[PDB]
Amino acid sequence: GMQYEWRKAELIGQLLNLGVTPGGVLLVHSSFRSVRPLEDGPLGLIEALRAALGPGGTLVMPSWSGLDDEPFDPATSPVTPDLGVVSDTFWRLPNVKRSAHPFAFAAAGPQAEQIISDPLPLPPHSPASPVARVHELDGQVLLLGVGHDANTTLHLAELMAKVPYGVPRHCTILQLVRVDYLENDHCCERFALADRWLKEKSLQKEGPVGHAFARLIRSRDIVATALGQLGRDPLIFLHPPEAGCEECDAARQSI
Ligand SMILES: [Cl-]
Ligand SMILES: [Zn+2]
């Protein structure tokens, strides 16, 4: 009811207290519904993120469409509604770059060109994808009002582990020429296991940003931790057949 509208300067303080590194690279998965209400809305949250990073920092967000039948255009193609209003708002602002493939990210800062430059990666989160360019630049991953099921960097860890499962997906690029690949996609619910893995090793910082429960982990810690669990169980992220997950049993089928 009478919830507090967070000011921009307050959000910067929360982000610094959470542990965001000024001048660093920060990949942010967000749900604005969790952070809301704020004064000045989603742009205010973006301005707070950019201010916490400072002029040397680079802010990165997912920015893909999800439409496998439609070609992607970095100038008009909207972000899928599942990534939130902040992601769909970030890429439209001035001087923020965007990848030129349907699995795009958006980045603004002195490092945006390096994180965005790569062509279409198959699977979408391969070692040649923006999520890997954040990892090689020692970036931070901010989970803003979302769980680890949205931690895209975990998908990169599956690919680096050479994970056995791979279901066929597809997309469209202009040369309507369908491009199918083998992706490691599932319900992603079991990604929440990484929460206990990381927090217990003291690798996950937790705190409030706005009204949201926020989690901040170094991208290298996400990959290194997950690679150890994947090295013990390549199917650690797969629901057992007992749980009867339709999205997970499909990945089990394709070896
Ligand atoms: Cl949202
Ligand atoms: Zn599942």
Numbering used by the authors: 0 to 174, 178 to 257
Question: What does the literature reporting this entry say, word for word?
Answer:
Here, we conduct a comprehensive functional analysis of the Antibiotic_NAT family of aminoglycoside acetyltransferases. AG resistance is primarily conferred by three classes of aminoglycoside-modifying enzymes (AMEs): phosphotransferases (APHs), nucleotidylyltransferases (ANTs), and acetyltransferases (AACs). AMEs permanently alter the AG substrate, preventing them from binding to their target, the A-site of the 16S rRNA in the bacterial ribosome. The fold typical of the Antibiotic_NAT family is evident in all structures, composed of 13 α-helices and 8 β-strands, and determined structures superpose with pairwise RMSD’s 0.8–1.0 Å between 197 to 266 matching Cα atoms.
Our structural data includes the crystal structure of the AAC(3)-IVa enzyme which is the first molecular image of a Group 1 Antibiotic_NAT enzyme. Our extensive structural and functional characterization demonstrates that this enzyme mediates broad-spectrum AG resistance, including to 4,5-, 4,6-disubstituted AGs and the atypical AG apramycin by evolving a more spacious active site. This is achieved by a C-terminal extension and modifications of the structure and residue composition of the α4-α5 hairpin of the minor subdomain of the enzyme which allows for broad spectrum of AG recognition. Finally, insert 4 is a C-terminal extension to the major subdomain unique to AAC(3)-IVa and forms an α-helix and a C3H1 Zn2+ binding site. We identified a Zn2+ ion binding site in the C-terminal extension of AAC(3)-IVa structure. This feature may be of only structural significance since neither this ion nor the sidechains of its cysteine and histidine ligands formed any interactions with the AGs. The binding of Zn2+ could stabilize this region and allow for orientation of the Glu249 residue for AG recognition. The Zn2+-binding residues are fully conserved across Antibiotic_NAT Group 1 representatives. The buried surface area between subunits of the AAC(3)-IVa dimer (~650 Å2) was formed nearly exclusively through interactions between the major subdomains of the two monomers of this enzyme. Collectively, these observations show that AGs can adopt multiple bound orientations facilitated by the dramatic structural changes in the minor subdomain of AAC(3)-IVa, thereby supporting broad substrate specificity for AG modification.
